[PDB]
Design a binder for these strands. Structure first.
Lengths: 66, 66
DNA sequence: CGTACCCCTATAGGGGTACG
DNA sequence: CGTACCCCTATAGGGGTACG
Protein backbone atom coordinates (compact mmCIF):
# COMPACT_ATOMS: atom_id res chain seq x y z
CA UNK A 1 0.00 0.00 0.00
CA UNK A 2 1.99 2.96 -1.36
CA UNK A 3 0.71 6.51 -1.76
CA UNK A 4 3.23 7.28 -4.53
CA UNK A 5 1.31 5.00 -6.89
CA UNK A 6 -1.62 7.44 -6.88
CA UNK A 7 -1.93 10.28 -9.36
CA UNK A 8 -1.60 13.88 -8.11
CA UNK A 9 -5.36 14.55 -8.26
CA UNK A 10 -6.03 11.29 -6.45
CA UNK A 11 -3.75 12.52 -3.67
CA UNK A 12 -5.65 15.83 -3.69
CA UNK A 13 -8.87 13.92 -3.06
CA UNK A 14 -7.37 11.56 -0.48
CA UNK A 15 -6.12 14.58 1.48
CA UNK A 16 -9.53 16.24 1.57
CA UNK A 17 -11.15 12.90 2.44
CA UNK A 18 -8.70 12.46 5.33
CA UNK A 19 -9.86 15.88 6.50
CA UNK A 20 -13.41 14.54 6.71
CA UNK A 21 -14.99 16.15 3.61
CA UNK A 22 -17.95 14.67 1.70
CA UNK A 23 -17.58 14.40 -2.07
CA UNK A 24 -19.72 17.52 -2.77
CA UNK A 25 -17.52 19.73 -0.56
CA UNK A 26 -14.38 18.25 -2.15
CA UNK A 27 -15.84 19.18 -5.54
CA UNK A 28 -16.46 22.79 -4.52
CA UNK A 29 -13.05 22.95 -2.87
CA UNK A 30 -11.26 21.77 -6.05
CA UNK A 31 -13.77 23.53 -8.31
CA UNK A 32 -14.71 20.40 -10.31
CA UNK A 33 -17.94 18.40 -10.45
CA UNK A 34 -18.93 15.79 -7.90
CA UNK A 35 -18.89 13.30 -10.78
CA UNK A 36 -15.18 13.83 -11.33
CA UNK A 37 -14.42 13.64 -7.61
CA UNK A 38 -16.28 10.33 -7.38
CA UNK A 39 -14.14 8.95 -10.26
CA UNK A 40 -10.90 9.86 -8.48
CA UNK A 41 -12.29 8.37 -5.28
CA UNK A 42 -13.04 4.95 -6.74
CA UNK A 43 -9.73 4.90 -8.63
CA UNK A 44 -7.89 5.74 -5.41
CA UNK A 45 -9.88 3.11 -3.46
CA UNK A 46 -9.13 0.35 -5.98
CA UNK A 47 -5.44 1.25 -6.21
CA UNK A 48 -5.00 1.42 -2.43
CA UNK A 49 -7.19 -1.64 -1.91
CA UNK A 50 -9.40 0.18 0.60
CA UNK A 51 -13.10 -0.65 1.02
CA UNK A 52 -14.34 2.86 1.82
CA UNK A 53 -13.42 6.49 2.30
CA UNK A 54 -13.42 6.03 6.08
CA UNK A 55 -10.75 3.32 5.73
CA UNK A 56 -8.75 5.74 3.56
CA UNK A 57 -9.17 8.51 6.19
CA UNK A 58 -8.09 6.18 9.01
CA UNK A 59 -5.21 4.73 7.01
CA UNK A 60 -3.95 8.23 6.21
CA UNK A 61 -3.97 9.13 9.92
CA UNK A 62 -2.59 5.88 11.32
CA UNK A 63 0.28 5.82 8.80
CA UNK A 64 0.72 9.58 9.07
CA UNK A 65 0.85 9.88 5.28
CA UNK A 66 0.14 13.61 5.27
CA UNK B 1 -17.02 18.61 22.01
CA UNK B 2 -16.41 16.13 24.83
CA UNK B 3 -16.24 12.34 24.57
CA UNK B 4 -17.37 11.92 28.15
CA UNK B 5 -20.81 13.27 27.18
CA UNK B 6 -21.43 10.04 25.23
CA UNK B 7 -22.77 6.84 26.75
CA UNK B 8 -20.44 3.82 27.03
CA UNK B 9 -22.09 2.03 24.10
CA UNK B 10 -21.76 5.18 22.00
CA UNK B 11 -18.02 5.22 22.76
CA UNK B 12 -17.90 1.55 21.76
CA UNK B 13 -19.34 2.48 18.37
CA UNK B 14 -17.12 5.56 18.02
CA UNK B 15 -14.00 3.46 18.60
CA UNK B 16 -14.92 0.91 15.94
CA UNK B 17 -15.77 3.70 13.48
CA UNK B 18 -12.38 5.35 14.11
CA UNK B 19 -10.94 1.96 13.12
CA UNK B 20 -12.69 2.32 9.76
CA UNK B 21 -15.43 -0.30 10.27
CA UNK B 22 -18.78 -0.06 8.43
CA UNK B 23 -21.99 -0.45 10.47
CA UNK B 24 -22.54 -4.12 9.50
CA UNK B 25 -19.10 -5.07 10.81
CA UNK B 26 -19.59 -3.06 14.00
CA UNK B 27 -22.85 -4.96 14.60
CA UNK B 28 -21.11 -8.33 14.22
CA UNK B 29 -18.18 -7.26 16.40
CA UNK B 30 -20.56 -6.10 19.18
CA UNK B 31 -23.07 -8.89 18.65
CA UNK B 32 -26.00 -6.51 18.14
CA UNK B 33 -28.07 -5.80 15.03
CA UNK B 34 -27.12 -3.23 12.42
CA UNK B 35 -30.28 -1.38 13.36
CA UNK B 36 -29.03 -0.84 16.90
CA UNK B 37 -25.58 0.24 15.69
CA UNK B 38 -27.19 2.88 13.46
CA UNK B 39 -29.09 4.23 16.49
CA UNK B 40 -25.90 4.68 18.53
CA UNK B 41 -24.09 6.23 15.56
CA UNK B 42 -26.96 8.67 15.02
CA UNK B 43 -27.07 9.62 18.71
CA UNK B 44 -23.29 9.98 18.86
CA UNK B 45 -23.22 12.25 15.77
CA UNK B 46 -25.89 14.63 17.06
CA UNK B 47 -24.35 14.88 20.53
CA UNK B 48 -20.81 15.42 19.16
CA UNK B 49 -22.04 17.77 16.45
CA UNK B 50 -20.36 15.76 13.67
CA UNK B 51 -21.91 15.51 10.21
CA UNK B 52 -20.70 12.03 9.27
CA UNK B 53 -18.91 8.92 10.48
CA UNK B 54 -15.85 10.18 8.59
CA UNK B 55 -15.65 13.45 10.54
CA UNK B 56 -16.08 11.33 13.68
CA UNK B 57 -13.15 9.09 12.64
CA UNK B 58 -10.94 12.07 11.69
CA UNK B 59 -11.81 13.87 14.94
CA UNK B 60 -10.90 10.82 17.04
CA UNK B 61 -7.46 10.63 15.39
CA UNK B 62 -6.60 14.34 15.32
CA UNK B 63 -7.56 14.86 18.96
CA UNK B 64 -6.31 11.37 19.86
CA UNK B 65 -9.57 10.69 21.70
CA UNK B 66 -8.59 7.06 22.06
C1' DC C 1 -29.92 3.19 28.60
C1' DG C 2 -29.70 -0.21 25.05
C1' DT C 3 -32.19 -2.72 22.19
C1' DA C 4 -34.66 -3.07 17.40
C1' DC C 5 -37.53 -1.75 14.33
C1' DC C 6 -40.42 1.63 11.20
C1' DC C 7 -40.32 5.62 7.69
C1' DC C 8 -37.86 8.19 4.35
C1' DT C 9 -33.89 10.77 1.79
C1' DA C 10 -28.94 11.45 1.09
C1' DT C 11 -24.48 9.81 0.14
C1' DA C 12 -21.28 6.63 -1.46
C1' DG C 13 -19.38 3.41 -4.57
C1' DG C 14 -18.35 0.23 -8.77
C1' DG C 15 -18.96 -0.79 -13.46
C1' DG C 16 -19.09 1.49 -18.11
C1' DT C 17 -18.15 5.08 -22.17
C1' DA C 18 -16.33 9.32 -24.04
C1' DC C 19 -12.85 13.00 -25.17
C1' DG C 20 -9.14 17.10 -25.00
C1' DC D 1 -4.64 11.84 -16.82
C1' DG D 2 -8.32 14.53 -15.77
C1' DT D 3 -12.60 15.53 -16.94
C1' DA D 4 -17.93 14.24 -16.75
C1' DC D 5 -21.33 11.58 -17.35
C1' DC D 6 -24.25 6.89 -17.84
C1' DC D 7 -25.93 2.72 -15.24
C1' DC D 8 -26.98 0.40 -11.08
C1' DT D 9 -26.89 -1.36 -5.87
C1' DA D 10 -25.11 -0.47 -1.27
C1' DT D 11 -24.41 2.19 2.64
C1' DA D 12 -25.38 5.92 5.61
C1' DG D 13 -28.20 8.97 8.14
C1' DG D 14 -32.27 11.58 10.50
C1' DG D 15 -36.79 11.39 12.24
C1' DG D 16 -40.08 8.38 14.74
C1' DT D 17 -42.30 4.42 18.19
C1' DA D 18 -41.71 0.68 21.33
C1' DC D 19 -40.11 -1.92 25.54
C1' DG D 20 -37.28 -4.52 29.33
Amino acid sequence: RDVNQLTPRERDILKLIAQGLPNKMIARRLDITESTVKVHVKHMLKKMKLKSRVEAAVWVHQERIF
